[model samples]
Target: AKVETHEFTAEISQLMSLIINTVYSNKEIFLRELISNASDALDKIRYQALSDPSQLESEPELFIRIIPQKDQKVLEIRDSGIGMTKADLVNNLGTIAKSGTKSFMEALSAGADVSMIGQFGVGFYSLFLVADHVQVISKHNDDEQYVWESNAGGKFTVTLDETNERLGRGTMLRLFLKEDQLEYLEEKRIKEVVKKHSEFVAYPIQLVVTKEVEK
Candidate 1:
């Protein structure tokens, strides 16, 4: 099948702004979203690896890495999970899940399944609320690795990755955080968020923490 690109519908764009910018009160909540996503990714791989042991060998260690680069004004949350093929990226990251969102809303209106945290594939776009640019490097066991780059401006570029040196068979989400949100680099804040939201995650959550030693 020929690959095709479709723009977000007008309704979807308005919904995106509402979810990405106004739904949340604080930027700190982004840490929870990223970590929750990381946990979900790990669960996907664990299930898939059960049938194909080769996938396990490639990325046996399931862990989340939070590396803070204060000088660069970037915070990267990475994980070993079920990565995506090119088509998966275009479908999952490039388009809004309008059907899912609509169903969720209808359920809520009818007083059913009202506990959903997000709808309309809005969780991924939430990264844009804090970062100016986002880069996703993913490797699928069945396809050549690829990168998805976007500025959350309704346009994105998905290309074959030049580097095949994947650390594992999963995804790495790099957030180019805005200058005002740099406090995320602090060790205490990062740790608190992880413990609160992702302490029970199936995989280990590792944070690069800096501390001063008492003399």
Candidate 2:
């Protein structure tokens, strides 16, 4: 398939900036959003597979794993879910042009649930709030793997990931965290965020908790 690109409509760009600046105040919310998105992705694949069993042959389990790189102040949230194709990346991530920012604001102003506001799909843009750079590696169930990278700015790039065999149908979100948010790399903090928001999620959520042991 040929690569495609587009510029964000003026209103969409403004909405993106507003969403990034206001929606996620606490850095820890990054983990929450990532986990929620992962869960939604898994649900999509499960429902699709129910109609066509062949889809499950490649990947059946649904899970989310958060790994940390403290030295770089980065955190990676990986999931086995309905990964995106190139067009999916462009339309979902690139074309904020289609979202209804006005209605989202009206829902908030009229005291409607702001939490449900996120389920509207624009919440993915919040990842840019905490990370300077973001890399998304995805493998669609029926297509070859592809990767999308951005500084979370006006322009970003997409290319095929050469080293992409690990995931059968999934996506890996790598966030290059800012300096002040390094605490998210700590095991305790990651566990705290997961437990607070996602303890009851149907799929498995794993945290590599390590406590100091007396020798």
Candidate 3:
């Protein structure tokens, strides 16, 4: 398989390092940021679909799914939203804070939205606080399946995922949690975080509920 690697612009490198190691007063908010971003993506597709119904494709319903692979300590968030192109990942995730982590870097001290309170762009990095490794598989009608991944070791990679029908539309994020941050992988804990942060979001948030079968 062919591969492409991109070094983080210096500011992103520093920002990611700052996010991963430093104390985040409320770590659970990572879920909130992610959920909000998913909501935004869904909103984008919704707008586009209105102009062209075919954009709905096979999956017409717009929803968010949180799947936890407990055995592997991985948490996956999937959204039936407008996914991104290769350049989108490179620019949005890779080129953030291009002018300095500048107005935004100082903006952290300026005041909080997923903000320092929900800039989804910066909010994306909040994942570093919980997961040491992150992978995003995204699909857009205009582009093929692509995977964006990083361990936050000052670099990230984007690869083509050939033959993946896993998503008909939108993006899926896989978070490999820090061993200590494993609670974020729990169904109950995730539900609590969702209820607390994005309960009012218009799009439905569905979490896979695994129940025990009595023998």
Of the candidates numbered 2 and 3, which has the greater lDDT value? 3
Clashing residue pairs in all predictions, respectively, total 0, 0, 8
Residue-by-residue lDDT tens digits, candidate 1, 64-150: 898887777878788888877888777674344656555544554565422243543345555656787877888877777787776
TM-score for predicted model 1 compared with the true structure = 0.79
The sequence of per-residue lDDT tens digits that candidate 2 reaches over residues 48-97 is: 98899778777777888788877667778888889898777676653442
* True lDDT of residue 141, candidate 3: 75
Model 3 agreement with the true structure over 1-215: per-residue lDDT tens digits:
56799888777787677678856667888888888889999999999889898989847889999998888899999998999888776877545436535445567655643235255256777888889889999988788789988998777898898754568888999999988899887877887888888877988888886678999
lDDT of 2 at 162: 79
Report lDDT (CA) for all predictions: 0.68, 0.71, 0.80
Better of 2 and 3 by TM-score: 3
Give, for candidate 2, the lowest lDDT window spanning 10 residues. Answer: 93-102
lDDT of 2 at 140: 90
Please list the residue runs of candidate 1 whose C-alpha ends up more than 4 Å from where it truly belongs after superposition: 1-6, 9-12, 19-24, 94-96, 101-116, 119-121, 163-165, 209-215
Worst 10 residues of 3 by lDDT: 112-121
